[PDB]
Amino acid sequence: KNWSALLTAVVIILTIAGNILVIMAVSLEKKLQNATNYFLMSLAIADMLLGFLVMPVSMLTILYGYRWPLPSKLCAVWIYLDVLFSTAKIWHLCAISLDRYVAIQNPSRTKAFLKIIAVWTISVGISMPIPVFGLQDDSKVFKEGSCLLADDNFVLIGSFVSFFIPLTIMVITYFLTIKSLQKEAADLEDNWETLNDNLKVIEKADNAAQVKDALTKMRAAALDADILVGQIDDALKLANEGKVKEAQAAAEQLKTTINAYIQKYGQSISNEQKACKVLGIVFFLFVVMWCPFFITNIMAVICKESCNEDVIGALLNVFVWIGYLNSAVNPLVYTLFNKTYRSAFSRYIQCQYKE
Ligand SMILES: CC(C)CCC[C@@H](C)[C@H]1CC[C@H]2[C@@H]3CC=C4C[C@@H](O)CC[C@]4(C)[C@H]3CC[C@]12C
Ligand SMILES: CCCCCCCC/C=C\CCCCCCCC(=O)OC[C@H](O)CO
Numbered sequence: 001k002n003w004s005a006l007l008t009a010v011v012i013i014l015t016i017a018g019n020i021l022v023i024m025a026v027s028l029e030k031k032l033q034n035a036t037n038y039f040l041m042s043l044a045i046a047d048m049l050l051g052f053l054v055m056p057v058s059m060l061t062i063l064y065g066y067r068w069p070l071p072s073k074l075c076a077v078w079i080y081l082d083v084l085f086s087t088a089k090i091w092h093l094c095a096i097s098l099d100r101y102v103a104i105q106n107p108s109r110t111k112a113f114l115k116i117i118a119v120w121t122i123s124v125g126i127s128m129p130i131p132v133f134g135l136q137d138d139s140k141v142f143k144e145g146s147c148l149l150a151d152d153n154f155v156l157i158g159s160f161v162s163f164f165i166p167l168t169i170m171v172i173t174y175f176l177t178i179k180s181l182q183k184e185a186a187d188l189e190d191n192w193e194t195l196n197d198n199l200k201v202i203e204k205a206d207n208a209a210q211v212k213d214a215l216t217k218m219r220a221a222a223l224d225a226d227i228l229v230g231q232i233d234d235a236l237k238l239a240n241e242g243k244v245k246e247a248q249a250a251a252e253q254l255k256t257t258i259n260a261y262i263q264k265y266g267q268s269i270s271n272e273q274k275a276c277k278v279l280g281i282v283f284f285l286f287v288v289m290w291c292p293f294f295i296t297n298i299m300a301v302i303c304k305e306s307c308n309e310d311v312i313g314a315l316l317n318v319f320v321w322i323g324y325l326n327s328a329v330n331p332l333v334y335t336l337f338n339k340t341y342r343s344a345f346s347r348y349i350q351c352q353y354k355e
């Protein structure tokens with residue numbers, strides 16, 4: 001007789017319906033057809049699967065006093081499905097943070113799908129010892145008739161390899177991606193004060209030497225952010241030919257072209273930083289919500305005999321559901337911090353599917 005199962009039934013439904021909306025939005029909405037959102041759909045499938053396969057069986061054990069209700073050889077399957085989905089969710093978030101950083105340092109839907117299949121095939125290979133060595137020995141998967149990973153070596157290896165190692169790569173790549181966009185917003189501010197300064201130099205000039213010098217330093221700055229460079233080179237031969245006046249009215253024609261490319265590359269820097277902040281919330285919530293479970297998991301092993309393992313087991317039964325609540329909160333962030341997901345989720349609820 002448990003009041004917990006009611007509270008846990010809400011978490012299964014918000015998981016399933018929330019993440020169905022995300023899979024529907026990336027499949028259907030043409031504004032969301034980029035590589036990041038393809039990883040977020042794949043993550044949503046894992047969340048939905050966690051709420052279909054893992055979370056209802058977890059609710060069932062609460063209803064049988066943590067005694068394993070199902071057939072014994074279904075224990076290792078439930079432990080494999082949960083760890084498979086949990087390994088995929090962290091290695092996806094690592095693969096997003098990694099893939100976005102490379103993109104800043106670099107200039108397809110198949111390009112993304114190949115990365116996603118790689119992450120899933122890695123997460124199948126990692127989780128493989130759980131049934132291979134646990135369907136053979138129930139000792140590794142049972143503890144006083146309770147289905148939990150009981151093998152301490154699998155817990156330790158599994159905690160770092162499945163959770164801590166990709167977390168570290170993710171928290172490094174997120175920092176370096178923020179530092180990359182602060183450099184690119186900074187480098188674009190610098191070239192503005194090169195271009196804006198030499199447009200003021202050209203309209204003060206008496207002689208062809210001052211315009212040719214200032215057009216030369218405008219072209220150099222033009223090279224860091226093609227139309228502008230050619231337009232500048234066009235005004236240079238005017239200044240080389242000594243046509244100062246002709247050069248001076250040529251360079252205020254550049255001024256309408258400079259604003260057009262400065263505010264385009266500078267809107268798109270601001271869009272990435274807005275997007276980086278939204279993924280950061282997604283990253284922050286996965287670490288914080290799963291941290292109590294994974295730390296307790298380790299202290300259960302470290303103070304094996306020293307600590308009250310009845311209480312430490314009772315803390316895990318709470319903390320595993322804080323992390324299950326994380327499945328429900330990817331799609332709420334998407335509502336609150338993206339107009340494209342919110343508009344999509346609005347139409348899907350009112351049952352309009354046309355874009
Ligand atoms: C909030 C995030 C970042 C971390 C939270 C971890 C907390 C909730 C966990 C991790 C380790 C846990 C402790 C591990 C060991 C023991 C000794 C045991 O005899 C009583 C409970 C007690 C004292 C636990 C209390 C809860 C605990 C402190
Ligand atoms: C060539 C060497 C072969 C030696 C075979 C000895 C068999 C010993 C028995 C059991 C486990 C041994 C292997 C454990 C490897 C774990 C690797 C892994 O990724 O596990 C993750 C964890 O299980 C969840 O996340």
Ligand SMILES: CCN(CC)C(=O)[C@@H]1C=C2c3cccc4[nH]cc(c34)C[C@H]2N(C)C1
Nearest residue numbers: 058078079082083086149155158159162320
């Ligand atoms: C309700 C009881 N269940 C369900 C099978 C658990 O104890 C799960 C055990 C896990 C676990 C142990 C040890 C190492 C690990 N790496 C990654 C995970 C992991 C996933 C982690 N899940 C989220 C809970």
Ligand SMILES: [Mg+2]
Nearest residue numbers: 193194196197
């Ligand atoms: Mg200046």
